[PDB]
From a paper:
OGFOD1 catalyzes trans-3 prolyl hydroxylation at Pro62 of the small ribosomal subunit protein uS12 (RPS23) and is conserved from yeasts to humans. OGFOD1 in Homo sapiens, Sud1 in Drosophila melanogaster, and Tpa1p in Saccharomyces cerevisiae were found to catalyze prolyl 3-hydroxylation of the highly conserved Pro62 and Pro64 of uS12 (RPS23) in humans and yeast, respectively (Ban et al., 2014; Katz et al., 2014; Loenarz et al., 2014; Singleton et al., 2014). We describe crystal structures of the human uS12 prolyl 3-hydroxylase (OGFOD1) and its homolog from Saccharomyces cerevisiae (Tpa1p): OGFOD1 in complex with the broad-spectrum 2OG oxygenase inhibitors; N-oxalylglycine (NOG) and pyridine-2,4-dicarboxylate (2,4-PDCA) to 2.1 and 2.6 Å resolution, respectively; and Tpa1p in complex with NOG, 2,4-PDCA, and 1-chloro-4-hydroxyisoquinoline-3-carbonylglycine (a more selective prolyl hydroxylase inhibitor) to 2.8, 1.9, and 1.9 Å resolution, respectively. Prior to its assignment as a uS12 P3H, crystal structures of Tpa1p revealed that it contains tandem DSBH domains, only one of which, the N-terminal domain, was predicted to harbor the catalytic machinery (Kim et al., 2009; Henri et al., 2010).
Following optimization of hits from high-throughput crystallization trials, diffraction quality crystals for full-length H. sapiens OGFOD1 (542 amino acids [aa], 63 kDa) and S. cerevisiae Tpa1p (644 aa, 74 kDa) in complex with Mn(II) and inhibitors were obtained (catalytically inactive Mn(II) was used as an Fe(II) surrogate). With OGFOD1 the C-5 carboxylate of NOG is positioned to form hydrogen bonds to the side chains of Tyr169 and Arg230 (analogous interactions occur with Tpa1p); the latter is part of a conserved RXS motif that binds to the 2OG C-5 carboxylate in a large subfamily of 2OG oxygenases (e.g. deacetoxycephalosporin C synthase) (Ser232 Oγ and NOG C-5 carboxylate oxygen distance is 4.4 Å) (Clifton et al., 2006; Aik et al., 2012). A glycerol molecule is observed in the apparent OGFOD1 substrate binding site and forms a hydrogen bond to the NOG oxalyl carboxylate (2.3 Å). The metal and NOG in the OGFOD1 active site are positioned similarly to those in the PHD2 active site.
Numbering used by the authors: 24 to 371, 430 to 451, 456 to 542
Write the structure that this text describes.
Amino acid sequence: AEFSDAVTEETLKKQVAEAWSRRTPFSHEVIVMDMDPFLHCVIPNFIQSQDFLEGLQKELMNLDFHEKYNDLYKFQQSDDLKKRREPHISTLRKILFEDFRSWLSDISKIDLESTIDMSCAKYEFTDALLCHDDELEGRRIAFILYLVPPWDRSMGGTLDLYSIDEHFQPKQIVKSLIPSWNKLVFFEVSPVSFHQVSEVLSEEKSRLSISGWFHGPSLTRPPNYFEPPIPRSPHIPQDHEILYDWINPTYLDMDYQVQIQEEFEESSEILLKEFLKPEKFTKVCEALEHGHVEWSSRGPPNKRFYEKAEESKLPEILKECMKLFRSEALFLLLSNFTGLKLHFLAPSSSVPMCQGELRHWKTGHYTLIHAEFALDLILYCGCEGWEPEYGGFTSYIAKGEDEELLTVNPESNSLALVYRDRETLKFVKHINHRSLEQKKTFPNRTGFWDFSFIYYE
Ligand SMILES: O=C(O)CNC(=O)C(=O)O
Ligand SMILES: [Mn+2]
Ligand code: NA
């Protein structure tokens, strides 16, 4: 078979070339090219023969698919396609990396390489590929060919394109493309080519595609942008005694503390169940569930998406719970738990510091991998029956590696303490639509909350 005869029609090819050259939009029955937020093009009915495409779908669906998972994505990818001998796949390689490539090279004036770079992806319920720019040395043009059944926005899996802010960081979704059978999309890989595949919501259907890159000369990426560090602050000096009113007495016993520290020093992590006194814990959950709290959304999408409480406007019990975690007394307690020097009265410049926030996590929220030693603290509220399959767990990994070192699962009134070295990173995995199963049990609840603090020696 062959890709659409109608785009190789020379008058159209030259008009497309002009539009590329001038970075100007161009619309036609068989091809649309847009420049906002960045250069992307859509070719419906990319391949003329429906029979070839059905034969292609069949071969692909008869491949073995392996699970792909990390902070950025969750989906299935095929046995690789490059050396694959099945005839429809073989033909497609040639259609893409000889015929279509020469056409693209001509209109783009980019000398694209023959290098074959293509995979087959399957996205099903809860699968998603979050905000990213495709940047990798050599990648110049991204392409995706959809081989999906009848598809609509409600089924998810949209190819979303982001606008960008002053600092070359993604701002928000300004284009959302719906996949459809035999539609090809391609776009330029650049420092601003931010995009995602939105979560697939259909529980029945499977989003099938061929995707990859045409390789070309390495462009010029600008300097790596570093966000303004979140302000840190020393402990709130002690006025009134606050620990014995808030903390489970078990954990305020000295002999239990040395045992905790013994365990903590071996693994540099611990999990303390029923950390707060239930009297307080329930008042805290009560306020979160029935009180007035002002939330704001945190970004940008290529780093994070979750809700954070406006701390100054919190109900007193939540204000006080935050003050607890900022308090001199807790700094000292954590020293006793960990053997870290977070207070001057703890055994043996430096002034210890912390940053903290009250977070709300629900469907769609996440953080991604982006150096310093630090102690992470999390206290979970309102997540009974929360399942790992929902996402929302915190995963710790070794840097420059795919190795998970630890997983923290939301559990009510459990305090997780985890020490990070400079070669250790963390993220909160994308919370997917299975989490809606929560409402079968707690109909008036949506997601869960935590107190998330970081302490520095
Ligand atoms: O499949 C899509 O619609 C978009 N794919 C990608 O951005 C990718 O695989 O890197
Ligand atoms: Mn991509
Ligand atoms: Na570490």
